[PDB]
Amino acid sequence: MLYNVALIKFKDIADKRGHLTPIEGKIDIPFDIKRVYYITKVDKDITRGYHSHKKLHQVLICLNGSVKIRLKIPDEEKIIELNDPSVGLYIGPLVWHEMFDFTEGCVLLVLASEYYDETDYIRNYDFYIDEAKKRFL
Amino acid sequence: MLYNVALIKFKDIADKRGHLTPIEGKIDIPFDIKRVYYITKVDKDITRGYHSHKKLHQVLICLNGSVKIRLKIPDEEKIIELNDPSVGLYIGPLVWHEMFDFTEGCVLLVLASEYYDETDYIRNYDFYIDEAKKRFLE
Ligand SMILES: Cc1cn([C@H]2C[C@H](O)[C@@H](COP(=O)(O)OP(=O)(O)O)O2)c(=O)[nH]c1=O
Numbered sequence A: 001m002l003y004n005v006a007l008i009k010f011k012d013i014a015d016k017r018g019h020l021t022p023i024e025g026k027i028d029i030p031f032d033i034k035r036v037y038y039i040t041k042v043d044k045d046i047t048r049g050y051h052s053h054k055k056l057h058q059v060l061i062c063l064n065g066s067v068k069i070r071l072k073i074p075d076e077e078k079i080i081e082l083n084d085p086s087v088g089l090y091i092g093p094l095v096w097h098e099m100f101d102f103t104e105g106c107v108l109l110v111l112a113s114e115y116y117d118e119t120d121y122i123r124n125y126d127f128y129i130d131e132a133k134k135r136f137l
Numbered sequence B: 001m002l003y004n005v006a007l008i009k010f011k012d013i014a015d016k017r018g019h020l021t022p023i024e025g026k027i028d029i030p031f032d033i034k035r036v037y038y039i040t041k042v043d044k045d046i047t048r049g050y051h052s053h054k055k056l057h058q059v060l061i062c063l064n065g066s067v068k069i070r071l072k073i074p075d076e077e078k079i080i081e082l083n084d085p086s087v088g089l090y091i092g093p094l095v096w097h098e099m100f101d102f103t104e105g106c107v108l109l110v111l112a113s114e115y116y117d118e119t120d121y122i123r124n125y126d127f128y129i130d131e132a133k134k135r136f137l138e
């Protein structure tokens, strides 16, 4: 099984006016929201991501259509489809992830605990594996 | 627009892999983000909203499809259509708004300066007007 990952369930307020989910920082997720970002209009043959973070905490949420997330740590690979706006996928440090099968109209929103910092990314898989092994085995 | 309202333009990092817009609190919007919420799956005939806030700062953003925002202060109305994920509509305190014409698959994201507080809502239009009149009138 897979360390440093959780699925977080949010409130979904649904009636004849539609659906509404609220997320309060440190309350419905464990961290303060310093930054958000969202991905839209990804062609269906694209795989995005391919990175890890040393310090950042993030929660991924698919608010329209569907997207699959491949999560890896050494010797373990999991795939989680996200297709319910009221479920968040929490990814801690040193998990490697990849996002693919973006459906038509898909919207991926990420909530993040720090401002964008290029030095906090690991983008080379061989460097990731090296660093992750020190933690995991 | 009106008083206390602005359209804000965000980075759209667009390439062969798609679009990505990042928003950092205090930086790309003028406040720190304590709460987000998002509305989805609204039927074509629904209007929602129907309120103002005294303290809350907010930024509205349509991430898919299209949705119209009706903004009111006393004796002035403007209608803004949201249809670009790279454009946010900032609404400050003492502005009444309603949301309507949510298209099929519309997603409306709201960034908010404070945690949900029902006492900061004004939900009755006449009360809204009485309070707002204080603010805006000579
Ligand atoms: C996530 C994010 C990316 N960017 C920029 C950094 C990169 O140059 C570019 C592409 O992001 P990248 O992290 O490579 O994409 P993904 O997670 O979708 O695979 O966007 C920001 O400026 N701010 C941000 O918050």
Ligand SMILES: Cc1cn([C@H]2C[C@H](O)[C@@H](COP(=O)(O)OP(=O)(O)O)O2)c(=O)[nH]c1=O
Binding pocket: A013, A020, A022, B035, B037, B039, B048, B049, B050, B116
């Ligand atoms: C916005 C929001 C609403 N809610 C709850 C309380 C309200 O009764 C309901 C939201 O409806 P309301 O704000 O009245 O609707 P809209 O903005 O779409 O017109 O859900 C929260 O618990 N937290 C929140 O942040």
